[PDB]
Symmetry: C3
Subunit: 357 residues, 3 copies
């Protein structure tokens, strides 16, 4: 039993047609008591074919949108105008709750895959979408108002309102496109916009923290991007404050997560993650990851302010190397000098050769 592992098939389909799909991960606390810290957050996946449009809608939740694959055009509609953004792979943006938006895949050949992280507040753990369009699955929300309210509001006869706004035009909310100051800070940012925080011949990790990004600061979230070569190992380490929701994007990751529970109580959670699989890494739990193939993953860290990552192996940022000999001698079965010598054997930091010996 691994209560931290969310396979790709634990996403429920909200909508699917020939043009794309929207899927919603089960609540983090559906099957476990151990993830109450995550009860206000939901994960969605949006996939769309080339030359498609997701129709205008607003969400009741704040959304952090990330392009995992492809390219998008995002339009955010405000009461007095609209903002249009091109999103390339690795671009993220916050969409404030209550902003009507639509999404286009402008590519002629490549699918679009987007991760949406929902931060709920209206009804904690619930995310709702309000589509202007009537479709087979639901009438327009405008159609729920009475005839008298609609005729008065639009100063128009009901039959004109029904024929122009309310009747079903599209089968579904993903459609094919027709065939032949504060502006700067609210803009998309790329996960690889800055130098990687860890980088060697085996792997790289990029990280954007709330301390360095105003959209993330509002949400208390960090975003990271992991790139590893086949055979590389991201050595045992833990996060002091962030709980990381780790999403497999490309490749296969062999994760080992070490936990302490209340039912003594030391547990190895081990899983190989394929594309779309998620594992939650609680703060203070040691974790390591071996690349079974060339891989790319994205991490969404909640409770992110003042997070510090502590390493247990390798040369740099290894907390065990900072214990003085007289105390390491009492802590470990080796002598102080033997512990010190063992911890100096690994000349690499962060990512190492994971080949068996």
């Amino acid at each position: 039993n691994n209560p931290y592992l969310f396979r790709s098939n634990k996403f429920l389909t909200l909508f699917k047609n020939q043009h794309g799909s929207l899927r919603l991960l089960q609540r983090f606390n559906e099957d476990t008591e151990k993830l109450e810290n995550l009860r206000d957050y939901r994960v969605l996946e949006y996939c769309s074919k080339p030359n498609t449009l997701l129709l205008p809608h607003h969400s009741d939740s704040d959304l952090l949108v990330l392009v995992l694959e492809g390219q998008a055009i995002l339009v955010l509609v405000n009461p007095d105008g609209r903002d249009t953004y091109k999103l390339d792979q690795g671009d993220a943006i916050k969409i404030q709750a209550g902003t009507p938006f639509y999404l286009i895949n402008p590519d002629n050949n490549q699918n679009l895959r987007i991760l949406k992280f929902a931060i709920t507040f209206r009804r904690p753990g619930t995310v709702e979408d309000f589509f202007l369009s009537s479709t087979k699955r639901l009438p327009s929300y405008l159609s729920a108002f009475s005839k008298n309210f609609l005729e008065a509001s639009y100063d128009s006869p009901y039959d004109e309102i029904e024929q122009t706004l309310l009747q079903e035009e599209q089968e579904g909310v993903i459609v094919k496109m027709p065939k032949d100051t504060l502006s700067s800070q609210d803009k998309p940012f790329n996960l690889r916009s800055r130098d990687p925080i860890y980088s060697n011949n085996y792997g790289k990790l990029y990280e954007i923290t709330p301390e360095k990004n105003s959209q993330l600061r509002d949400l208390d979230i960090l975003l990271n991007c992991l790139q590893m070569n086949e055979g590389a190992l991201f050595v045992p380490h833990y996060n002091s404050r962030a709980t990381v929701i780790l999403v497999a994007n490309e490749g296969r990751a062999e994760v080992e997560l070490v936990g302490l529970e209340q039912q003594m109580q030391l547990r190895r959670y081990a899983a190989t993650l394929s594309e779309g699989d998620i594992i939650v890494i609680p703060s203070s739990f040691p974790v390591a990851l071996k690349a079974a193939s060339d891989l790319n993953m994205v991490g969404i860290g909640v409770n992110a302010e003042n997070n510090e990552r502590n390493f247990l192996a390798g040369h740099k940022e290894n907390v065990i190397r900072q214990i003085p000999r007289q105390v390491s001698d009492l802590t470990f079965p080796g002598s102080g000098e033997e512990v010190e010598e063992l911890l100096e054997n690994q000349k690499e930091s962060y990512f190492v050769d994971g080949q068996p010996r």
Copy 2:
């Protein structure tokens, strides 16, 4: 079933005599799961006859006090002095938890009606009042201390303490009056102290936001005041972040609230509100309101920071008018030009003639 509607008779009487009453609305989450966002808030109503006093007491909760009808004298007692405020109709003030206060109706002819919004923190969803006076319903809290503690504290014999402080003087906590720097920011503010944000021949809305008021900023609350002429319609719109607790003060309001639930799932909640009735308008839910008579209402918006109200009809702030023709053509059954022409039929903004046609 309308889980958002709280009729005036869902207030329970905490105290009533010939001089006035104090009533407490049932918990927002008593009968529904849909209002967990409101579980820390309670609504009270205080009504008193001319020339009456509500006896000194402190609350365990923060209170936002609003005069709906009449005039009051409010006295706030601190350890080193007291502050005295005159409150006229529409005046609001925050009373910090643990401040002993009393309230007078100084008018010789007009009742006093006050709305108290309680923000609980000691015992989430519970509000308690500690009265110094012994009355039929409860002894003074001072009387719960032992004789030895009282005699030592007051350096006085128990019989003097009992005769001067503890014995019952009044039947109840509402009594008749005897017949013949930081001071500036902590002061009462009127809901109509600034120009209305929306104003035409049909209606006005005044709004005070936490961005513009230091007492509201502490609570993350906005306060609004709605005035409409009989026959006027406040057209379909939604709030991006605020959940508004709408209180009918004067007149009859025909509300249409449009919701999305999880048991597809589009619902019209329609009710005519008379004086004292409440309806909760969740953020992102479209809402409209027709005046069945000249009316006045007060709205208490929780989660208020950075709220934006999006209109769905009328000329100004209409988000549907900001969708470009090529996308409105795909969104709606009308052509782009037909949608644009329909949305330009209503020349008014915010409030319109609601007469049936």
Copy 3:
């Protein structure tokens, strides 16, 4: 039934050997609904004999550490070094979650007693400790990683890793020692570092508030230290915002706590606290305390920002003395002048002679 009283024997033993013990108080909300405000907090007690070491570990929770008796050396390990602090009696320090630390009792004769207040966020109401050492009760968390992960991480054969780091060296996590800029603000602070806020011939109270201390500001906690002579009474008073967790350190305290509940509803909770006993004083509840012996207590106030303590007896800060005669006459059975005269009988403030008369 006193749901606010936590006797010393409601601490469960997490670990005990001949060198010391670590104990964990039951959850505040285990046996009552009345302390939901405290569900994220846990109280621990650490006791150790002379010349002992608590082995290196990190916690998943923030810890506020206070020395109740004796002296300690605290070492905080960071990824790039370590900080060493001497803690004397009354010294407090915040240990951020995820910081590996160890604790020494360097005294040759005196036990060390520490109070740890845990502020949980990973799993609300749960605190976990990750020890590097394998002991009888649990293997090292490093031992939960696979052989292949360990050999690759440490670039060393498993047998060397097992013999140097993983095999059991110590029976338990408390061992005997071998026999023959931001640095300033992160440092320990003493509860008696400033003048006492209340001080007379009967008692003293020291208090450190989040407004005056950056470590406490992060946690929204105040810390107080009470010293009273046998026979002294800390007169009836209440806190406007803070809920105080009162810990008996030395001596016997006769507490009277006055509460209002929902099952009219006035209750005296009276108990004599001996060393190690705790009582929770909810905000707005009147409280008084008589010293049955010379005593010292420590109070941990949660929800501490802008707390104000209101006195009900004595000369200074007595809110009842600030009610004008015309209203005290209506509030109390005595005349306005009789109330005023009674409240002036006690010439002392805060602490008074508690001798029976």
